[PDB]
Amino acid sequence: PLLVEGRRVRLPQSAGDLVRAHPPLEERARLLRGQSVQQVGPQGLLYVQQRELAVTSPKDGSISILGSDDATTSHIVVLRHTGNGATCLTHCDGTDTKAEVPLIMNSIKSFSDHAQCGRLEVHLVGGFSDDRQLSQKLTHQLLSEFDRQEDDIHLVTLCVTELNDREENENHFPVIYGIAVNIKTAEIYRASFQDRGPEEQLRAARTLAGGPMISIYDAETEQLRIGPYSWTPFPHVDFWLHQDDKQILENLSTSPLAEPPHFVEHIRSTLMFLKKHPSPAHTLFSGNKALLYKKNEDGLWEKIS
């Protein structure tokens, strides 16, 4: 079940009510929202896209920081066992939360040396008070699915939906769009990411075409493993490529007035990828082999094999 200050959470309950009733949650939210955003560079970074999961631990010699950005109505989730340091960062968008929380749980529970030290801690950030209730629904689903687990999960950070909301000109949008977690130090902090590779377009197209949550990183081999992926041709991809920025925002975004400024440019490059690669399974991959990337000496991703 989900625990706050060592006791069970009553669900359903709004995130704001939870935070107001528990001073540790309120202080964490105040401090997190108050941080200035750090521009996290590529060294030791694994950037996790929407509908992806990455897990590793402090003995990883390649990755020291997990991060995700652009959480508009979606939530970034961090589950950490403070004893062995196993740390999973996930960017959930409400596609199938009941399937996705078990994936996060199993990614951490497989690490042993877990009984003698530490505990399971969970952190949830993202979203805002959006007109379509998408963030609030995601918050409820994540809290409920974690609370139905048998193991004790201690809720440490909760900065979602109404807690993550700001207003300008009667227009609401998120405060925190992105966070990083340092796996060695356990720090979780506000962050933005300019270097989101590798295979940024392939991975974005996989999710725009409707792919489910996937785990992208093999901590044992310190290998990023991309694909093989498959999809059918994206409907009306040429038509959407010919629409103007306002039409793309209103129809291809969950919240047209809350997206970050580069949203349309990002989706145009994803649509172009889909247009160029309507059937990637046997054109972008060989013999069903994943594309393999490892960190090089200077902390950048490099393709192997």
Residue numbers in the entry: 2 to 306
Task: Give me lines lifted from the publication on this model.
Although yNta1, NTAQ1, and NTAN1 do appear to share catalytic functions commonly involving a conserved Cys residue critical for the deamidation activity, they exhibit low sequence similarity to each other.
